[PDB]
Design a protein around this ligand. Sequence first.
Ligand SMILES: CC(C)N1c2cc(Nc3nccc(-c4cncc5ccccc45)n3)ccc2N(C)C(=O)[C@H]1C
Length: 124
Amino acid sequence: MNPPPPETSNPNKPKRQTNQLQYLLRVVLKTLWKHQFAWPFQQPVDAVKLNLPDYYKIIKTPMDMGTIKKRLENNYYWNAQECIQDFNTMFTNCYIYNKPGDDIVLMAEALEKLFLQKINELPT
Ligand SMILES: CC(C)N1c2cc(Nc3nccc(-c4cncc5ccccc45)n3)ccc2N(C)C(=O)[C@H]1C
């Protein structure tokens, strides 16, 4: 029931190092990563482990912070907006699959609040 995880390396994809990407790794991702509610999001959803064969029938663009962290560390992105889009995919997937007030949604909402806080002053 688990698809192959999102790629974290792609040799023919063009890459750039920017100050915004460095901040997304050093500040934004590490602050989220340490948060008490981060653990569900530190790796792809394991639908076999969870016995949720429906998960990847609903969520067609999966994304997790373990993938985003590996992408940042491997210099996968062209620009910060591509990374921010991955974070937003992750949050949105959580809101789509689950229902308002679910524990997992409270977790995602807390992380997203912190995320928007940290990106409120991206560098230049
Ligand atoms: C809702 C839950 C199934 N959830 C989820 C689970 C995990 N991992 C995990 N591992 C062991 C036990 C559990 C677990 C069991 N029961 C209730 C829970 C309530 C709140 C958190 C976790 C729970 N969850 C990882 C990611 C997700 N994401 C992002 C989702 O959107 C859905 C698919």
